[PDB]
From a paper:
To examine whether or not the shrimp nodavirus capsid proteins could assemble into distinct particles in the absence of N-ARM, the crystal structure of the truncated PvNVSd (ΔN-ARM-PvNVSd, residues 38–250) was determined at resolution 3.1 Å and showed a T = 1 SVP architecture. In the final atomic model, the ΔN-ARM-PvNVSd comprising residues 66–250, without the disordered N-terminal region (38–65), organizes into the prevalent jelly-roll β-barrel fold with adjacent eight antiparallel β-strands. The T = 1 ΔN-ARM-PvNVSd SVP contains 120 Ca2+ ions occupying the Ca2+-binding sites at the interface of each subunit, which are conserved with the T = 3 PvNV-LP. In support of the conclusion that N-ARM serves as a molecular switch to control particle sizes, the negative-staining EM image of the ΔN-ARM-PvNV SVP (residues 45–368) was also recorded. The EM image showed that the ΔN-ARM-PvNV indeed form a T = 1 capsid of diameter ~24 nm consistent with T = 1 PvNV-LP. In addition, our two PvNV capsid protein deletion mutants both assemble into T = 1 SVPs, suggesting that a deletion of the N-ARM seems sufficient to produce a T = 1 capsid. Our recombinant PvNV capsid proteins assembled in vitro into three PvNV-LP categories, i.e., T = 3 PvNV-LP, T = 1 PvNV-LP, T = 1 ΔN-ARM-PvNV SVP and T = 1 ΔN-ARM-PvNVSd SVP, with corresponding diameters 350, 240, and 190 Å, respectively.
A major factor that limits the expansion of shrimp cultures is, however, infectious diseases from viruses, such as P. vannamei nodavirus (PvNV) and M. rosenbergii nodavirus (MrNV), which have inflicted heavy economic losses. The Nodaviridae genome comprises two single-stranded positive-sense RNA that encode the capsid protein for viral capsid assembly, the RNA polymerase for RNA replication, and the B2 protein for host RNA interference suppressor. While the shell domains (S-domains) of PvNV and MrNV contain conserved sequences of 62% identity, the protrusion domains (P-domains) and N-arms show low sequence identities of only 17% and 43%, respectively. In this work, we have determined the cryo-EM structures of T = 3 and T = 1 PvNV-LPs at atomic resolution, the crystal structures of the P-domains of PvNV and MrNV (PvNVPd and MrNVPd), and the crystal structure of the S-domain of PvNV (ΔN-ARM-PvNVSd) in the T = 1 subviral particle (SVP).
Residue numbers in the entry:
A (entry chain A), B (entry chain A), C (entry chain A), D (entry chain A), E (entry chain A), F (entry chain A): 66 to 250
The structure:
């Protein structure tokens, strides 16, 4: 029972995309990041995660930081599904996807030229999750999955459509974990 | 963490069956009702269950109410298996099926012209269960399954065999739930 | 502010009906009794209700008492809608009607050869209602409407269909009211 | 009496409009959003609202978040009328419309490239409202209606008129409700 | 929540009428004054009432003051109906009209050459009412309606019938209000 | 003695002006707004002010909100003179006008693309002021006058002079008043 954190780690870059690149609701899913302790190869936290059998986030907050000037605009909504077998990749309505998104807890909505954060909501029971690579069922290994859904046109200084996908910011995880039972795995 | 109830909902009708219709022990299983918050389409509780990620019954009591006069008779035993992968559909002995039945906890045994109830026994650990349709494994989604086993001949005012299956009563659920984490699913 | 009761009054007879008489879900509505203080002409309570401007039930419990032997059977569900502009007269599914019924609060379900009761659930706010005949909108005058829905075949001593509608019991109201502001109306 | 929240839901997109599109004061009304628990189809809150007879917002705060860069500008005023039968769609003076707007309580005024919020002011009495679709009178069902009034020219990086309506941001509701009396409706 | 008062305002003149002018019970209704905060154009209170969404009288007392010498006589009864959809304009019996009148609460009866007062009885619930002009239903806007019923012949110094209608006094309102939620309307 | 507020009302639009339009120090006075309770026709507060003889602001804070993007710039100083017979319309030096401005109390200085506020400083004595239109002397009726002085060139994204006056934002009043003695005026 070893409590590590609070500490940070780098997740991914994030790319806003031009209207032309969004043909269906599923195309609005800019990132889909699994949030096991073990799902960020090269990171400190995933490095650690191979040395205990199980983990549980106490706090795991995804932090978006922009890389983009205030002369472009694009609205995201960001959220963490605690059920890794739910999947919005297959909803046929744009509005429905964004609704399902904001209705998660801790969801947050913002213009992509701005830093914002989203907490992982912790379970009511005290469930721990298996470290390491996924085996038969994700519900044993993934405490959550982080999503960014693009809700709005990527727009320019004059309100006109940007013609080309733009890598716009980065995701970082600010984390506090309990790890249980030393293993090497 | 939203505690809903106590409240009621309608499950199914129940049909006692004539000796002729019971050829094997499995034929004695008059109802097999899964008891997830999400397994009664059209009900209030299942309606609700799509708006939180997980659920746990605090109390979930199945209530049988008769629809049959006191000039017919038939003895049921009613019980809720907390393991949704156990399955008595395949026991070859009549006595064995009814034994396995009464030995569950909260089991109850009664003449079908009488109201009776059966509680779901809550887990010793504090396990929550996934709302919504079942995915890979039922043990993640079904907190229990409700059974009525017919133990006795459906008999008439004079002790003679009724010749024809008789829809004899109804099942209702009186429930108290915790729902955790708002989702739309 | 005059608190009258607890006291009783006679509402109506109730008639269970033969399978032949139930052609659509709406046909299952055996009684539809508005529950204003002023909606039972000839009764003591309605007599009183003309002498105050407004009323509010503190307790208003509908009591069914059978008039039928234990050699017939028929299952009712009884409930009081607090919204007098809701109307189930127009649901196309049998199951749906009974579900909507049991899901009301204080609903109760029983075999028609048995006395049972159903309370009116009081509002969370402290709303009073206008006495006397209805004017433009029922929501100003009807604190609730009482329903009996028949859920099951009217059946005989041997489990066979009764061929003819049967007046089976009676409804009584056991009431406690606040009446406000003396008027003659 | 079930207290749900605090939680979020997605209302609508919002479109600022070019001077050319604003010909009369009524044309300044960019959004007119009824705020019953039941008036946002597809949302979590409206999903819930079909399972209780009545509702009352404890807090219902409309949150505008921009989708527009800092090289355009346009001033809104946002407010929630608690009377759903008041209607400014028919005032003949521009100034008068905006005055009537800011004079509501909780009104707020801002440049559309900025996140801002507006609370629903709660009633002095403790009135609950009917869930579900509107029947005869809105005053029984709508606790309020949310408005955005555009007060200023949609202007570009150089102070010149934008020639074309611009979908500029989104509305979200951060809500806390009491729901009373379980119903299915 | 702004408590204004105690303060006064002028309602109307009142005209006693000669036997010849009273042909039916309805003709005895000398005044019929709605008592919303907003129903006295030109007054201070109605002036105010356009700047809050709703109102509720705490005290609203109608004060009759004579304008007539002690050599004429005529008996009034004065009362305030809290139900603005009740209407005595259509009772066929003289006695019945005056009875219905005195039986209101706070009713008062007097000779028209004398100052007298009548309070509005406040509701048992805490209902607020909509300010401004009436929309669909008066029960949302009128907290009450004030009546003067003439019960007796307008008579002269010698007990003989006055031949001609006589404007005999004036009505004033002494009021204390709560106004809720600033609006301009 | 009726304390109204805190509440808001709309004052005016404000127009920054191009270098060409500023020929003398007096031309820098972009707004000159008298702040009696009675000096904003159409507003809620001025509406109210006709129903008491006198008023005194407890707090009266002028709130500027921009309507202009961050690609233009212009520095204002905003202040409220408590002496309505002082008048800077006639100072011959630019620096002197702005000095006299910032030296008022509660004065505030800012770039016009930014929300800022300025309080009215309350008197050391407890002076009340006459409501309604001005009669012989302003010192009996105006508790203060609000000014915006432009201190800097209206400049573009590249530091070059904007050639044309630009309506740049709006003024709102957030107020708390005591009103004394009911009158109709
Ligand atoms: Ca392992
Ligand atoms: Ca799920
Ligand atoms: Ca009445
Ligand atoms: Ca309803
Ligand atoms: Ca109104
Ligand atoms: Ca004056």
């Amino acid at each position: 029972i070893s409590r590590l954190g609070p500490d940070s780690d780098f997740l991914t870059s994030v790319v806003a995309k031009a209207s032309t690149s969004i043909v269906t609701p599923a195309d609005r899913i800019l990132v889909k990041q699994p949030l096991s302790a073990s799902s960020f190869p090269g990171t400190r936290i995933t490095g650690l995660s191979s040395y205990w059998e199980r983990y549980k986030w106490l706090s795991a907050v995804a932090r978006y930081v922009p890389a983009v000037p205030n002369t472009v605009a694009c609205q995201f909504v960001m959220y963490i599904d605690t059920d890794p077998l739910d999947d919005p990749s297959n909803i046929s309505d744009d509005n429905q996807i964004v609704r399902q998104a904001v209705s998660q807890a801790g969801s947050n909505q913002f213009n992509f030229n701005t830093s914002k954060t989203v907490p992982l909501i912790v379970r009511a029971d005290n469930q721990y999750y298996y470290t390491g690579v996924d085996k038969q069922n994700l519900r044993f290994s993934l405490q959550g999955i982080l999503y960014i859904i693009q809700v709005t046109d990527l727009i320019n200084f004059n309100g006109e459509l940007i013609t080309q996908d733009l890598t716009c910011g980065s995701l970082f995880l600010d984390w506090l974990v309990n790890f249980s039972i030393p293993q090497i795995n």
